[PDB]
Each structure stands twice: as C-alpha cells, then as structure tokens.
Design a protein around this ligand. Structure first.
Ligand SMILES: CCn1cc(CCO)cn1
Length: 119
C-alpha cells in the first residue's frame, strides 16, 4: 500500500550493487581519457553514482524512472562493447540479471500501491 516505499528499497538495492564486484566499471561516469571515442557512440552516459545522486536529491518520481536510468547503464555497455565476450560487457550482463531479479518486486509493489491510491 505504501506509495513511497520504493525509495528506500532502491537505496538498499543500490547499496547491494555497489558491494557487487561486477559493478566496478559502472560506479562512476566512463572516463573519456580511458575511452576517447566514448561519446562518438554513446549519446547519454549513465552510471550508478549518478543514479544514486539523482535518487538522493529527490529527482526520481517513481522507481520506473530509476529503472530506465539503470537500464541505460547496461544498454550503453552493450552498445560500446567491441565484443559480446568482453570482460566489462560480461560483467554488465550478470549485474543486469541481478538488478532485474531485485527490481521486479519494487516495481510491482509501487504500481499496485498507486492503483490502490487511485481506486
Ligand atoms: C567503460 C564502459 N564500457 C567498456 C565497454 C567494453 C570494454 O570492453 C563497454 N562499456
């Protein structure tokens, strides 16, 4: 029933993602000195510190908006990878599976609570 519970649930999921070794390439914006052509391929950079900062600033209205930004981290890694077997892309696939497994109930509970609110 709680329309606000998604926020702390997302904060706790972000804490687990930060503890995950697979999140290391995605914890801060991609370094353009390391990947000089990054912005030639990627239009909208995104990383987990920016997602956490947006959430803590009160700049997400719903967990769907947070989920769109986290999915953008993974789609950027898929678009920038030179190979489907690269180390960083392989880490992104595992982290994506972990994130999707945990965000599903957060989205479901929020949408259910909102439908109840508008009944
Ligand atoms: C640094 C962000 N990033 C790197 C890749 C592939 C490197 O093999 C995808 N995203």
């Amino acid at each position: 029933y709680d329309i606000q519970a998604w926020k702390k649930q997302c904060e706790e999921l972000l804490n687990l993602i930060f503890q995950c070794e697979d999140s290391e390439p995605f914890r801060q914006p991609v370094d353009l000195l390391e990947y000089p052509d990054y912005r030639d391929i990627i239009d909208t950079p995104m990383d987990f510190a920016t997602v956490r900062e947006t959430l803590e600033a009160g700049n997400y209205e719903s967990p769907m908006e947070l989920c769109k930004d986290v999915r953008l981290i993974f789609s950027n890694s898929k678009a920038y990878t030179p190979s489907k077997r690269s180390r960083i892309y392989s880490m992104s696939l595992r982290l994506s599976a972990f994130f999707e497994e945990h965000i599903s109930s957060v989205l479901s509970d929020y949408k259910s609570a909102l439908r109840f609110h508008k009944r």
